[PDB]
Amino acid sequence: ASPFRLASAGEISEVQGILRTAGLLGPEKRIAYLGVLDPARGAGSEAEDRRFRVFIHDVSGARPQEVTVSVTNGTVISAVELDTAATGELPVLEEEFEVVEQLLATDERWLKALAARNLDVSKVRVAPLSAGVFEYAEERGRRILRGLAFVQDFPEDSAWAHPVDGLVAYVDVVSKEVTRVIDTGVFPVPAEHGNYTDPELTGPLRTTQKPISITQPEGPSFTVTGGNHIEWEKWSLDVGFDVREGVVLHNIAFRDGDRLRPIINRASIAEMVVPYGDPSPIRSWQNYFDTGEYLVGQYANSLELGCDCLGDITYLSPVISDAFGNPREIRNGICMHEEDWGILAKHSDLWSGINYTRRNRRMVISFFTTIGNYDYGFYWYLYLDGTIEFEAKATGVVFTSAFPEGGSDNISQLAPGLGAPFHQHIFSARLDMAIDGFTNRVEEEDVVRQTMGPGNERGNAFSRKRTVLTRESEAVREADARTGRTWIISNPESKNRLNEPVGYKLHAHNQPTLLADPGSSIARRAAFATKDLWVTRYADDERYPTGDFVNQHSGGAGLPSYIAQDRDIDGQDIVVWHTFGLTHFPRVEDWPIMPVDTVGFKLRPEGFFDRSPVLDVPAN
Amino acid sequence: ASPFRLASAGEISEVQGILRTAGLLGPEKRIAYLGVLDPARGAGSEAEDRRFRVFIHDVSGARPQEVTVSVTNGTVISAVELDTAATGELPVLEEEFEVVEQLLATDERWLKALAARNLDVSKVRVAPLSAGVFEYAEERGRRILRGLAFVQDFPEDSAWAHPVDGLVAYVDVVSKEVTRVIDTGVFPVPAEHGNYTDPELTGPLRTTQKPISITQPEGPSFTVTGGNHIEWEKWSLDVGFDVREGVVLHNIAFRDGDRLRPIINRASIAEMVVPYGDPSPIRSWQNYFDTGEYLVGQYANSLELGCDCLGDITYLSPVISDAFGNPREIRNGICMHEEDWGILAKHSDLWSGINYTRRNRRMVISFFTTIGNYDYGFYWYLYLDGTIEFEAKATGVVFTSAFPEGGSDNISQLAPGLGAPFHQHIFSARLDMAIDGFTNRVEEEDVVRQTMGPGNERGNAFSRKRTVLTRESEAVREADARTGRTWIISNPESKNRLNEPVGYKLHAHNQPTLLADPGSSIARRAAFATKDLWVTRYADDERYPTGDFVNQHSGGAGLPSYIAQDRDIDGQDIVVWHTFGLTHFPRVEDWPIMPVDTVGFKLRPEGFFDRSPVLDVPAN
Ligand SMILES: [Cu+2]
Ligand SMILES: [Cu+2]
Ligand code: NA
Ligand code: NA
């Protein structure tokens, strides 16, 4: 019944038939992206209109199209040819991963470089990497992928231990041409293996780990209705899934007594960028937008009970489309469960003699994704006390290079002759705010130091200042950990019983933002990442901080272009964009597979409730 | 057998007898502090010498003494009269808590102020607060406590909801004199109650929370031997307990294959300070060193299975001394258990087709303490991958005031007429480092931005710089979140297989440090808190960042005085002092009892192991 229900297999078959009868899905076509569109502002129209956005690629070489279709009304709504030299290529196709290794396997120049290194071609894996935009003018308009080579000694070998440095090729995957092959010098191929399941490397496994058993004998405290509508401990929300963004949260709300109070209309990780800091021309072009270029949702793992998700777990299995419009189920793609979170509140009073202790709990909603050497867990947490937290978990295998003779200021050595280039993982959270409704605004809050003097005779005083962001042109903000800087999203027209506007406070981790030079290509294409916080006026088509077509776009689209409109955000329908990430100087302990590292943010109520919202929690 | 074993009841009886026969523990004496001394550097002396340090107070008015005794040799080792006007008062006695309310209950000036507010004296609770050092010259040399009044409407009432503003008194607890009573004006006593167990306030309790069951059918994976020696998942350590510091960790080490590698010799929270930012003369003197002035260990709660500690929990019950030298057991004062911590490592490889997932685990060691309105949980965590984390959990009831007519820049309103002054909770972690032994050093690590140009043609490069701290005079460091600043403690004489010095990286949360004016009394007495990081050369008697006698000391002792020696720390026996804390602008949701807020730090291996140390973890 709900317009926010997950796309069904049936709905996706219907989309493929509508594109077929309309003659848009010919045998030369590929679906590069398919997703349900969110209902428009003011869903007061009786009965939904399930619409779908589709990106259609033409392998033969024709121009691609952007298509909207209504499955409610079996009709194509719009269909637009795209000039990709202008607005950007389409997302990388999964079938294109192999084409780079196969195109290179017959190229004369490729084989010359391999033979000079005594590499058997059937042993060389080639990674299909996004091209970006640089100085090669013949790439404009063309669908380009660059290739980096790794040696696999045998089928089960970890190729990441054997990079082939000094060598890169570029590939046009439509016309199937190796446009360039660059060989800047021979580097020794690192010899040590990195197979983390070889008893030779692991040694004997531990016998010391006794089991931890986490059960819920009466089942879980949350309920799911309609496929994806969660109700848990006064929280209410819909779990959506998009093949580009991954897990999306809609209609996050809190049942304060008898009325349902909205908090966030839509929450998602709307882009990630991984820029590399090795200035070597073999790699100085390396930057991946995993979300924008590859679509992280389509590589969601299936999560195993007992290994990935432990406890009483409820699964969701979202449906996406393959390149031909057939429905594909991702079995057990989303984990949801509650877990114990220690003490919520505690006090033993000397004067009343009353002792009081309550436990905290969190709702967990997660999925895990693999793009090549990288694996990423996306975790959303809901806590009893109203706090909302996001956490990214980064693991997998580090991207490797050779370690140069006598060192490097931009690469870490992980094993003899084996290096790891410096890089970042930067995420963009897009928070469509709905603090007690849609009239919201953002204040910046700084700690204020006071000087010893009149009115502050003992020099102990300190305060805080709040600056309202009224226009988009002044809502591009930087962190300042030293002054305790946070941001409050409030509703100026909704007050608590103290006659204060209700609000939520955003707590950032204050990690470094984009390190690249402001004149670089990557600072241009990933402008959102140069700043910690952006606020925009909501608009239906302002969906991604980089725009709709990241692959080989020349830069400027998305956030820098939205805020140019200089719209009013003082008490309006606004969207908060928060940049946060990890700056990774790889360590020996990251090799040969890396332990999880984490980064995130959280939002806590700030005068949203009239008292603590967890007075009614039992003792058990 | 171990010299780091917890003090026993027998040992404490023996201490009381030795002080008795020696005529130091007369009927006018009080033990204000008793603790075991750590073994000296080079414990190669066969058989230990269990020594004890004792602070002895004289209620009659004589001078107090500092005494060392050996229970191994039943002899007093040293005994020193103290000039407390010079070196500071002794810690606050527990029996002194009542004396302020009883001394004030017969004072003419106190009763005059109460009658002008129609307060029945038998209903007024008085909080015994530390005095600090300010402008009152008659306080030098005297044992002073200040008193703030709260109304209790009935025995089980929460007095914190009913502060009596505009009123403070000062009290000499030795001669029993009310030295001053200041009444700066009448404020309405806030009327709403804050009883969080009253069904009227809580409403009906939730019936929606189903149970979470955490069991270990084969028992826990860690072993305890000798009372307090932990071995768990290659970790090894001793859990100590001191009535001032609380839980202390000794001899933290990691079993890397066959050899036992030390990491940290001694870890403790060596001081906490809570400064208030309300400039009102009723409160502008308010600062508590809970550790230094009150001794947090002696207020450790007893932790209930199922409420405070959930799972398969092992308890320790430490023994301390009461004011008369009788042993007092704190039943179930320390919780230790392991808990599941999600995914440790994960990768699905496209080319090898191998799927790999491991879970992480943490060892938990905690206690909980109550000082008046405040409750604090101290958590030390040990992780499979070598990470060490500390976490403070702050809860209890916020300290309250009246909320003034038409607002305040230094106080939050929590209920009609009820305010909460701004304040901080600042902790000092003292880390006696032993990275693969005692030759250690500290480098500061900053991210380095590079300009687009020659050698960096595409403007993508970035690097990092490490600055060695060689003398104490240059080891007073500040955070800088914007440049990713961290600190590495390494051993220049111990290398990994890449010929890099092994090391651990300290990750700080980068919260604001002491906000008070640098000329304030509190910036003088709490100098450690004005800076994020200090490094000192180890010395037996350099134990606390504030010195041994915090109560009413005029300032400068501890860290600022140690570093003046300008000793060498480049490859030496060093101690790291890390300042971290919470800046608390109270919110409505903090009332009437506050949900937990957290702050901490962590240390991760940085080239300490030759590869990942968790390759040998099973799948289960
Ligand atoms: Cu990384
Ligand atoms: Cu506080
Ligand atoms: Na909004
Ligand atoms: Na040391």
Swiss-Prot record, chains A, B:
Residues making up the signal peptide according to the UniProt record: none
GO MF, any single term: copper ion binding
Disulfide bridges in this chain: 309-335
Keywords, sorted A to Z: Copper, Disulfide bond, Metal-binding, Oxidoreductase, TPQ
Active site (catalytic residues): 290 (proton acceptor), 374 (schiff-base intermediate with substrate)
Description of post-translational modifications: Topaquinone (TPQ) is generated by copper-dependent autoxidation of a specific tyrosyl residue.
Cofactor entry: Cu cation; L-topaquinone
Binding annotation for Cu cation: 423, 425, 584
E.C. number(s) listed in UniProt: 1.4.3.21
UniProt cross-references to PROSITE patterns, sorted A to Z: COPPER_AMINE_OXID_1 (PS01164), COPPER_AMINE_OXID_2 (PS01165)
Record's catalysed reaction(s): a primary methyl amine + O2 + H2O = an aldehyde + H2O2 + NH4(+); 2-phenylethylamine + O2 + H2O = 2-phenylacetaldehyde + H2O2 + NH4(+)
Stimuli inducing this protein: By phenethylamine.
Binding residues for substrate: 288-299, 371-376
Biological processes per GO annotation: amine metabolic process
UniProt remark on cofactor binding: Binds 1 copper ion per subunit. Contains 1 topaquinone per subunit.
Subunit structure: Homodimer.
Family: Belongs to the copper/topaquinone oxidase family.
The protein, known as: Phenylethylamine oxidase
Taxonomic lineage of the native organism: Bacteria, Bacillati, Actinomycetota, Actinomycetes, Micrococcales
